[PDB]
Amino acid sequence: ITNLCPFGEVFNATRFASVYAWNRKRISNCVADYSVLYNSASFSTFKCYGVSPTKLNDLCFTNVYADSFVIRGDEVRQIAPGQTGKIADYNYKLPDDFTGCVIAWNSNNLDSKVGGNYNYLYRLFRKSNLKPFERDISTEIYQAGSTPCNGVEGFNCYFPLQSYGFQPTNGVGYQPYRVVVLSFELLHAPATVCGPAAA
Amino acid sequence: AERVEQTPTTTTKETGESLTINCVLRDSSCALDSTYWYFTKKGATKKESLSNGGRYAETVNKASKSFSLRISDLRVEDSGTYHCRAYSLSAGMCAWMGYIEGGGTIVTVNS
Numbered sequence: 001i002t003n004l005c006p007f008g009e010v011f012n013a014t015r016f017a018s019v020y021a022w023n024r025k026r027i028s029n030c031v032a033d034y035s036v037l038y039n040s041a042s043f044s045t046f047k048c049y050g051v052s053p054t055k056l057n058d059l060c061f062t063n064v065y066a067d068s069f070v071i072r073g074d075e076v077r078q079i080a081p082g083q084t085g086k087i088a089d090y091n092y093k094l095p096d097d098f099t100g101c102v103i104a105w106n107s108n109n110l111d112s113k114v115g116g117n118y119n120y121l122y123r124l125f126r127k128s129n130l131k132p133f134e135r136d137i138s139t140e141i142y143q144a145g146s147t148p149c150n151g152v153e154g155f156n157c158y159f160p161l162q163s164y165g166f167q168p169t170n171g172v173g174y175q176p177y178r179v180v181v182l183s184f185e186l187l188h189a190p191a192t193v194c195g196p197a198a199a
Numbered sequence: 200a201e202r203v204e205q206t207p208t209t210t211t212k213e214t215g216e217s218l219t220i221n222c223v224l225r226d227s228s229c230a231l232d233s234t235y236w237y238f239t240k241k242g243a244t245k246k247e248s249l250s251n252g253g254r255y256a257e258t259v260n261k262a263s264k265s266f267s268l269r270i271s272d273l274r275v276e277d278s279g280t281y282h283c284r285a286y287s288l289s290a291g292m293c294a295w296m297g298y299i300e301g302g303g304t305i306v307t308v309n310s
């Protein structure tokens with residue numbers, strides 16, 4: 001079935017994950033019009049690393065993954081190789097050798113309420129940085145000192161997750177952005193994900 | 200923090216005045232290779248292409264990675280949100296190819 005990749009299911013999903021609990025959808029055995037995404041005009045960020053966005057329709061890949069989550073506008077810059085900060089270190093980390101596109105759009109109209117949207121969380125604390133594409137959904141109380149923690153919150157013993165408050169009248173830097181990260185894998189196996197214009 | 204800084208964030212103008220929006224690709228090693236402007240009317244959600252035509256004039260300084268849209272002889276139909284998109288398509292000093300976009304300018308025109 002040489003039929004269109006279900007990119008609609010990723011980009012137009014009703015629900016998006018919290019960044020700490022970021023979704024990964026495997027895409028295979030389908031034809032993908034990357035140009036319609038790139039030329040869309042809904043997106044505020046579209047950055048392709050190790051591949052030109054205008055040649056995507058001409059390439060085939062072994063596997064495509066679509067990772068998706070919500071962050072604040074001024075965190076979108078952290079979804080890039082080499083970056084540091086709460087998001088890049090403790091929630092979602094790209095490898096230094098990343099091949100793929102980082103795509104984002106303002107989602108203020110979907111992910112802010114009147115009185116503010118409190119449904120989204122991010123990991124604030126961790127013992128070390130995530131490895132590329134690592135996911136940590138643990139709620140173990142974080143031990144910031146020598147003193148053991150025993151699952152109990154105290155003066156150096158922190159709950160590791162905090163809530164985004166998405167206020168609708170805030171500045172764009174504080175607004176929610178939906179993000180999709182496409183990773184392109186080219187291995188020694190049959191290439192199952194192709195543009196319309198590829199062999 | 201690699202971003203496009205679009206100023207002003209909001210303006211109110213009288214019909215007949217002109218307005219200038221300035222964008223600069225900040226905190227980037229990336230070249231500015233092309234630009235694009237979009238408008239949504241007041242109370243609409245559709246992002247639509249600007250024409251680069253009679254009332255709308257564009258400036259670009261590629262070295263400084265800055266550009267501007269000037270709209271002359273404003274009307275009330277001009278009221279809405281303007282977005283600038285900055286393209287980097289060379290792949291030298293930039294790790295990436297594609298676009299990043301301003302936060303927008305919310306324009307209100309009275310009469």
Ligand SMILES: *[C@@H]1O[C@H](CO)[C@@H](O)[C@H](O)[C@H]1NC(C)=O
Pocket residue numbers: 007008011012037
């Ligand atoms: C999601 O939004 C609308 C559906 O009515 C459509 O214009 C757009 O292509 C969709 N996005 C995709 C398929 O990536």
